[PDB]
Design a protein around this ligand. Structure first.
Ligand SMILES: O=P(O)(O)OC[C@H]1O[C@H](OP(=O)(O)OP(=O)(O)O)[C@H](O)[C@@H]1O
Ligand SMILES: [Mg+2]
Ligand SMILES: [Mg+2]
Ligand SMILES: [Mg+2]
Ligand SMILES: [Mg+2]
Lengths: 345, 347
């Protein structure tokens, strides 16, 4: 009933897939039953034909059903993710924002890869900071228990994605597959701060999150950043109670001086490492501001699990707690505790 | 300057390529420097972004410039081709191939380009091969076939060996792309006229565009029933290409007295079955198959007339129908096929 020619032909006719087809196509790829030419066609055609939440949801689902889980009852019910799609065109604001959030006591489980794969970045910079990025399910859990944060290395948790990843490296261009990182976190946290460079596709990511009933803020800086920016306003899709809701967000309302795009910027892994140490050590400046802002974001999303949570006080509490996790040195200390953890195994 | 991410990114942005990019891409493909994923992505991306005449011409041109030519001065200025894209999803009898033989028998030089089937049960080359005709001849001997029989057959895999890299890849995706247009645009003998079949109603105008740029006299045809031939079951759309301009027409056989046929009457089988249908028609069997053969054959004869400006549409069709029918009725077509087989076995 399903088949590659059927599905590819339907995509090249500019038609949404029937429900199930996207899933079948991803399952073919996962099971190794997909020629690298079919993977490539699907990936491009799914992109040029504007992909829908259901379709993206089916891809992420199938991927997740082949992924290694974390052991039962080790992921707190209120964990969050802090991550972006990448393809921005930075300093690793997410990485820092994630450390600050965990430091404030919100459990964080992150998903990522090394740069230029379809499943997000940040592992390089984490590796340059001394953190062990590729641990199995059991140790990611133990890290989340002992440290307050764990990192799920995509190759480790999605070994069947191998093929799709190789193919996508060669076409060397953004596709619908670049949305899968935030959506295929093996630990399935119910909250998060999710950045997206591709503005059209943010609302699609948001809808996938709505269907999971997650409490998530998908964020797009109106300067094109895959984070909440301080260059200008941002667009936020507030995902709550299964509903999506598009908003405009201006950090001026909380006293954030406008910064230039090129101050939140210019980062290879060894440099990004140094920016983290600078900033976690108290270096004031536009990078700190944007880390503080995005961390508050994740903490607001965490508050949104409560369902009695109000938007503006949630942001103040968020800004307050992230500021304090930095200024107390709890964040710097958490990073250190994270590195030590990785050495004591 | 140019790269796969540059070119693939532009296409995915739903943007027309810059001049030279399509050519660079096709040239990477032809020389073996393109990865399978790059090829598939390009072909699919180029299809979903409506491709332009310039783009398809650059693909076709790179291909031609890598193909094996026929020798100097062996192709008449007025040679015609009779060939389609294939991929109509109907396994009809081989209309183009039967048309080609009739046309050569009317005294119009035919240099046909061809291939085995990709989806149907028997392609032109398959059916020709089943008849005793040699499909695998090289350039020199294709030239000699044309001189001695009046017809030559250029087997695409033989003249376009560097297409091998794109062939396997495109087969694997199993869906038609812009690449499915190249066969009829890459006849290595570069004849200036033809009747060119297109299975895809939405890409047929682009093919006409490519032919218009070369200043060929060509009718690009699509049956409104989906045939990559002139049909007899209904009307056909014709992009007439002449003096560098394209001109869209609708064509109705009823006007030249043709009864409406049913698609299943034009249906065919494997290479042996399709070879028996050619023998039946060239033998004088009246009926719908013959009807469609005569019709297309006139079609090509009209494209041939169109090499000369001041040829008029109606009298050229009428003259075309007389000559196609006569070619069959006098035994001339049936004899040329025999001479053609004889020629193969005598080298
Ligand atoms: O496999 P398909 O996609 O169905 O295509 C069937 C055939 O039609 C095309 O050529 P040609 O113009 O010689 O067609 P003919 O069979 O009508 O002679 C193509 O080269 C195939 O041989
Ligand atoms: Mg990020
Ligand atoms: Mg970023
Ligand atoms: Mg044909
Ligand atoms: Mg046909």
């Amino acid at each position: 009933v399903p088949s590659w020619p059927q599905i590819l032909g339907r995509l090249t006719d500019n038609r949404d897939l029937a429900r199930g087809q996207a899933a079948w196509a991803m399952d073919q790829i996962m099971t190794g039953n997909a020629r690298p030419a079919q993977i490539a066609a699907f990936a491009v055609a799914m992109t040029m034909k504007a992909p829908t939440a259901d379709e993206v949801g089916e891809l992420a689902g199938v991927m997740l059903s082949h992924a290694h889980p974390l052991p039962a009852d080790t992921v707190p019910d209120d964990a969050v993710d802090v991550v972006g799609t990448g393809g921005d065109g930075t300093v690793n604001l997410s990485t820092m924002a994630a450390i600050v959030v965990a430091a404030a006591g919100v459990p964080v489980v992150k998903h990522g890869n090394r740069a230029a794969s379809s499943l997000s970045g940040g592992a390089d910079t984490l590796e340059a900071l001394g953190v062990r990025i590729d641990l199995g399910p059991d140790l990611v859990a133990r890290s989340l228990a002992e440290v307050g944060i764990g990192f799920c290395f995509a190759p480790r948790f999605h070994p069947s994605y191998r093929h799709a990843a190789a193919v996508l490296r060669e076409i060397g261009v953004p596709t619908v597959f670049n949305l899968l990182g935030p959506l295929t976190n093996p630990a399935r946290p119910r909250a998060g701060l999710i950045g997206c460079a591709f503005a059209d596709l943010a609302e699609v990511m948001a809808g996938v999150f709505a269907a999971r009933r997650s409490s998530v803020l998908v964020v797009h800086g109106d300067d094109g950043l895959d984070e909440l920016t301080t260059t200008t306003t941002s667009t936020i899709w507030r995902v709550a109670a299964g509903s999506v809701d598009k908003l405009t967000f201006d950090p001026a309302g909380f006293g954030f001086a406008r910064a230039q795009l090129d101050q939140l910027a210019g980062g290879d892994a060894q440099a990004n490492a140094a920016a983290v140490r600078a900033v976690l050590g108290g270096a004031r400046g536009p990078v700190r501001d944007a880390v503080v802002l995005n961390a508050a974001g994740a903490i607001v999303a965490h508050a949104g699990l409560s369902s009695r949570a109000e938007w503006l006080p949630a942001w103040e509490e968020g800004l307050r707690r992230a500021s304090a996790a930095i200024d107390t040195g709890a964040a710097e200390q958490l990073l250190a505790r994270w590195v030590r953890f990785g050495r004591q195994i």
